[PDB]
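Practice problem: High-potential iron-sulfur protein
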Amino acid sequence: AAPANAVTADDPTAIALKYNQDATKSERVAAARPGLPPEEQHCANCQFMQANVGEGDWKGCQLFPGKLINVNGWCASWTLKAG
Ligand code: SF4
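Answer key — structure tokens:
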């Protein structure tokens, strides 16, 4: 079950970025964002994931202030975690 502040499918920014909490139900292949082959991309290996926000599988994303994403999710702003 998602936290009360999870990013949800109806959030305008989530729609614009084609976020999904489950990267296997995402369009990461179509987007072909650079840095890793697409099938390898999810929030856990994204630069915008905030490992010190949230709990468990539900972590922060700098693009979704006040909310939580799933570490197993994806959106079209995915960017390799470089530091
Ligand atoms: S920017 Fe990165 S951490 Fe945030 S939802 Fe998109 S893929 Fe996940």
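Discussion: The two ends are 30 Å apart (CA to CA). Students who identified this feature from the tokens alone can consider the problem solved.
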